[PDB]
Design a protein around this nucleic acid. Structure first.
Ligand SMILES: [K+]
Ligand SMILES: [K+]
Ligand code: NA
Lengths: 128, 131, 133
DNA sequence: CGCGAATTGCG
DNA sequence: CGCGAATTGCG
């Protein structure tokens, strides 16, 4: 049922909003493929969005067709629409997450990609 | 993928909450197969709940294996969960609809059925209609 | 940052959900001021909730403005909310714990109390004094 | 295992 | 309007 030849995105937040970080891993080995240092203020929908697009770029650079597993349906929609819809206030305290979200959107509106973007069935399989 | 040999339920609501009614119709042809008269006050989700269960009862009486189309994904969920989840106040005004819902639930918890409960896809197919 | 003349509660459980108990001790002396016999089936959070409410009634019974320390942020919020937002099924095996909990909410709804309810900071101050073994 | 507070589509 | 669901350290 799980597609093991794939890349999984694992985003954590210390509160929503709160410190947000993420890693992209090989789904089968759990090897860390890329990561993002903690961002002091973010939401988990923003972290998933960024994590997905980071993975899209990682896979594009390496000419991989492996799919991406996310477990935020909202961030998958945001990626598909090439537009994030966060309600998070934008100021100096949130400048970094918003700047990264801007950059991710920009990348999405200037590129094409092959990667399938799948929802992790947390109900059937557990956490990643 | 319309299955024409099926039943479709359609509920009307004079405001929500408000007066609720519903009918069961032949999907292929529009013929009204069963009806419930207006209920003085209920919700749209309670009526879709009752309409599905009513058709379940109707098809079960007739030994039909035909599916039922509903336009309400909430009501489909409720039936499959064998539990409505309305937040309508129980008072004197709402006693009727609430009686009917409890009786729908009780039927669901003491019965099994063959009938596939399918989602009507309005924007793919248009409205549910009775002729 | 530590009110030493205060009361501290904690829960002990074999499993979660499982057997649960609690006690209240004096924060300065570790003197055990009250105890709850092990309850066949509950959750830790239900136990913490009951332990705080027991402590509240204990101090109220004695006209004491000593604070209460718990290290369960959940149970604290539950008490301040006069509502135990537990997810334990209500059945016959869990009837006892649900009845003491329903009654603890009822007690909160119908009384006034002035005890400050404080979070114990385990990361900073070490173990809460009502810690079980 | 249990639990908080906040994020985000019809009919 | 009524109801839609899933996500994210410590005791
Ligand atoms: K594309
Ligand atoms: K609906
Ligand atoms: Na995670």
């Amino acid at each position: 049922e799980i597609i093991w030849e794939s890349l999984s995105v694992d985003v954590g937040s210390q509160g929503n909003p709160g410190i947000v970080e993420y890693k992209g891993v090989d789904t089968k080995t759990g090897e860390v493929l890329f990561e993002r240092e903690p961002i002091p203020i973010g939401t988990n929908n923003m972290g998933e969005f960024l994590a997905i697009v980071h993975g899209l770029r990682y896979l594009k650079e390496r000419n991989s067709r492996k799919p991406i597993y996310s477990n935020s349906q909202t961030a998958i929609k945001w990626v598909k629409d090439k537009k994030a819809k966060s309600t998070l206030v934008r100021n100096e305290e949130t400048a970094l997450i918003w700047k990264l979200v801007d950059e991710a959107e920009e990348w999405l509106n200037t590129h094409t990609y092959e990667t399938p973007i799948l929802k992790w069935q947390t109900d059937k399989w557990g956490e990643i």
